[PDB]
Amino acid sequence: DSLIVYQTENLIINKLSNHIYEHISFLNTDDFGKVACNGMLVLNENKVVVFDTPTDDKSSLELINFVTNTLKSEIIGLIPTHFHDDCIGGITEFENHNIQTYVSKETIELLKDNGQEFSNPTKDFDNSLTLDIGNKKVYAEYFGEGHTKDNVVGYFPEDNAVFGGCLIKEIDASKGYLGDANIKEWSTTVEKVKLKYPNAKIVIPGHGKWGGIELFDYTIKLFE
Ligand SMILES: [Mg+2]
Ligand SMILES: [Zn+2]
Ligand SMILES: [Zn+2]
């Protein structure tokens, strides 16, 4: 089970295993309640890969400073899992620490369709990304359209860990925001994620409580 290793009004970090930490930050984009938004920190040999910026610059700086001063580590790469602001909201702060961004090509196109470009040159991938993190490996993979057309999934096999992002719901979630979604394909997409990760023990959805592969099952059935 999970240790809280950092907590503040702007940022919560939960330690789930020896290599896998969950970061939680809060979107306040309108005149209504803030919404909790999850990402994944993968740690190995004092090197860190982050799936999803926290929601803004100040939350992202709390995360970077936590990695530097408390995990005594370097962040070697940022992988935004799609183009919404619960994935790239703090991108400027990461770019200002010269953290390499790794992002899919469809994600770049949708960002550009929406008027945004990364400032620092990105490292781009079509469907699948393999990154070395010291002597272990971390992956991002595109399985199909869901929550958005570009959504990718993070995977660290050493701890059997999957960052579902917003393609994956928590147990008993509502459907949520569908403005950019492909509802005809969401569930077949997650069937593929399930097929690829039968031994997953840690599955982190984009919002709400993490758990096991039952998050896959629940999300498949939600959009059937
Ligand atoms: Mg696994
Ligand atoms: Zn989204
Ligand atoms: Zn989301």
Side-chain angles (χ1 to χ4, degrees):
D1 223 4
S2 86
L3 299 175
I4 294 152
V5 293
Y6 179 96
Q7 176 176 36
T8 278
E9 65 168 332
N10 297 317
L11 181 63
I12 296 149
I13 304 182
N14 299 310
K15 181 169 183 175
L16 310 190
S17 71
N18 296 324
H19 307 289
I20 292 293
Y21 296 74
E22 177 195 42
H23 68 79
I24 311 184
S25 56
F26 304 98
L27 246 189
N28 181 88
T29 182
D30 64 36
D31 303 15
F32 292 97
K34 59 172 192 160
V35 171
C37 292
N38 298 333
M40 194 165 76
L41 282 207
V42 180
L43 167 68
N44 187 50
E45 294 176 313
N46 295 93
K47 312 274 130 207
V48 167
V49 168
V50 179
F51 286 90
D52 286 12
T53 76
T55 47
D56 61 15
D57 278 353
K58 75 184 140 78
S59 293
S60 292
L61 179 59
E62 293 189 29
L63 174 57
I64 294 163
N65 282 342
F66 167 86
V67 171
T68 295
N69 301 319
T70 305
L71 308 182
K72 316 289 185 168
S73 294
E74 170 188 354
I75 299 163
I76 57 172
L78 168 73
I79 305 158
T81 61
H82 63 284
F83 73 100
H84 286 155
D85 275 348
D86 50 316
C87 317
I88 58 149
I91 183 66
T92 296
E93 192 64 60
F94 279 76
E95 295 187 308
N96 283 357
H97 291 72
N98 308 295
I99 297 159
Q100 186 59 58
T101 300
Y102 293 84
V103 54
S104 87
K105 287 178 175 172
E106 201 180 345
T107 295
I108 298 180
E109 179 204 312
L110 295 176
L111 270 168
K112 185 52 202 123
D113 287 352
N114 304 49
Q116 324 196 21
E117 294 181 4
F118 299 88
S119 154
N120 276 349
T122 55
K123 270 164 161 161
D124 308 344
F125 63 94
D126 289 293
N127 302 131
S128 151
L129 171 76
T130 302
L131 267 180
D132 290 308
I133 180 170
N135 64 1
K136 301 289 158 262
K137 272 169 187 185
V138 78
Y139 304 83
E141 186 160 345
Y142 172 79
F143 288 88
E145 306 185 8
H147 172 76
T148 56
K149 308 210 165 276
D150 66 315
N151 44 204
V152 297
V153 185
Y155 185 48
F156 190 64
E158 188 61 55
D159 280 1
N160 301 104
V162 181
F163 179 62
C166 305
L167 184 79
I168 297 311
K169 299 308 202 193
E170 80 167 325
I171 301 291
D172 290 326
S174 325
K175 310 202 160 72
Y177 181 48
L178 302 177
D180 293 326
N182 179 332
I183 53 153
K184 293 333 207 218
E185 283 295 292
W186 203 319
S187 89
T188 88
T189 291
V190 171
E191 281 169 5
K192 290 172 196 190
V193 172
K194 177 183 153 120
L195 179 77
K196 200 105 175 202
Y197 301 129
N199 298 309
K201 295 313 292 212
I202 290 170
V203 175
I204 296 162
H207 312 264
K209 282 264 70 192
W210 65 276
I213 51 185
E214 72 276 6
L215 274 65
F216 299 163
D217 288 330
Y218 174 88
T219 301
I220 292 165
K221 74 159 150 276
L222 192 60
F223 291 101
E224 261 173 10

